[PDB]
Design a protein around this ligand. Structure first.
Ligand SMILES: CN(CCO)c1ccccn1
Ligand SMILES: CN(CCO)c1ccccn1
Lengths: 263, 265
């Protein structure tokens, strides 16, 4: 992988692995989400980071508030996918990281993603607006003019998601993370939550439809010793409303929506 | 990746990914095990398999793992390049064996090794069988004819008999269930998930102060997508050794047994 000529975006190629594909012999949405994080991490490293020097002194970190992914074609096992990523400053609200997925052979866009990140104190978990001093340290690594993976007005990536009402139509209960679900800092990887949301979709839907869009809001983290319940209700193509909550007290950890197309 | 000059082994390089590493910023044993399967799959494809032979598909026969044995000297760091070489050997009518050698691409030194025993089974009835002469004759041209072992040593750990853990277990992790990410393309639980489940019953303090050096895993029966598993561990021992058992939650039917050896950091 490498930064582009202007140094304002990053590209990387990936060959889809045998264990990364589902029953259709194409990459799962969780494989795609892992590749998005990997290219984001390689971009951060290439420009010297994704905490800045001032963020480390103030014990501040970037945390994902929202992830939105749209896939037109899932790459097949053995295929090469090219992913381009960049970041944009959203004033004092936070930052946004966008991605474009392309088939390396045809050059056509096979997917796109966007994510909203907010600043929080790593110890108290208190959210904050971005200070001028921190914002000034990362603006030189972003395109100054807007560059949006989802430009269209009133697009799915900015839609408000309601809270699922009991009783849920479908559910998968008692989900727990194992060590493979944790990142290097012993926190649950963001992609595990995507997997948990999908667990409450009936197997018949997965067997006859392809996931086209997923929007996920992240409200609170699941700890290594926490247990989660995944809830789904059909709202409709098939559309679903989702909710992940702690198994005991019912504390919301995530809410989301998925859109599926018939095969 | 590519077959070597003689066409009897296969090599492939991998750059360790951010989500593939643990607390020490080095590849987990599950990442290593996934890479071993990926290079095994690429080897099978390069020589024309899909790893069933033409006669195997006719008779509805498949290769299934009976035992996996991995020894790691150094886990590659995040961003490092690891080179893995793999080959297969015929073990007469008992079955086949796939071996691996892991090397640091920069230094060229061996950082790990693995060996696995595979047996033939009817895909539908699940009945094990010896390898017939006709099937064995179709894959011998893809194997070195003289023995080539990742674990040559006379009394090496890869061939040791593993006993059955007796109740009560010292440690346990109960109610483990596979999710869709744990399944392969055929909707069967991936073999690497069982390694993860075995490791779940090791206390976090051991993981935080030791490095896993060796794991030997016997595969007795598969866990189905709707099954629930209990992972049991008892210390048997500067090194710490453990005896492991995975069994179905409910009837207590054994799915795997194994041993791990850990060294102080
Ligand atoms: C806006 N950020 C995060 C700054 O902490 C970027 C920008 C480019 C590459 C990596 N991170
Ligand atoms: C002995 N076998 C299994 C053939 O069913 C090999 C050998 C080389 C590559 C792949 N499979």
């Amino acid at each position: 992988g490498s930064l582009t000529e202007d140094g304002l975006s990053y590209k990387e190629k990936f060959v889809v692995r045998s264990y990364e594909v589902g029953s259709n012999k194409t990459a799962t949405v969780e494989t795609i989400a892992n590749l998005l994080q990997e290219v984001g991490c390689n971009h951060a490293q290439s420009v010297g980071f994704a905490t800045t020097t001032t963020m480390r002194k103030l014990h501040l970190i970037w945390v994902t508030a929202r992830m939105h992914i749209e896939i037109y074609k899932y790459p097949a096992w053995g295929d090469v996918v090219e992913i381009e990523t960049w970041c944009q400053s959203e004033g004092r609200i936070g930052t946004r990281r966008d991605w474009i997925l392309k088939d390396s052979v045809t050059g056509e866009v096979t997917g796109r993603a966007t994510s909203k990140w907010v600043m929080m104190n790593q110890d108290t978990r208190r959210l904050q607006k971005v200070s001028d001093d921190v914002r000034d340290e990362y603006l030189v690594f972003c395109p100054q003019e807007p560059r949006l993976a989802f430009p269209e007005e009133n697009n799915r990536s900015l839609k408000k998601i309601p809270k699922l009402e009991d009783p849920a139509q479908y559910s998968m209960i008692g989900l727990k993370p194992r060590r493979a679900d944790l990142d290097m800092n012993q926190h649950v990887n963001n992609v595990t939550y995507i997997g948990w949301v999908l667990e409450s979709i009936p197997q018949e839907i997965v067997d006859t439809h392809e996931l086209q869009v997923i929007t996920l809001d992240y409200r609170r983290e699941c700890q290594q010793d926490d247990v989660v319940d995944s809830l789904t209700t059909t709202t409709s193509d098939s559309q679903f409303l989702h909710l992940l909550r702690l198994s005991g007290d019912g504390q919301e950890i995530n809410r989301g929506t998925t859109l599926w197309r018939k095969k």
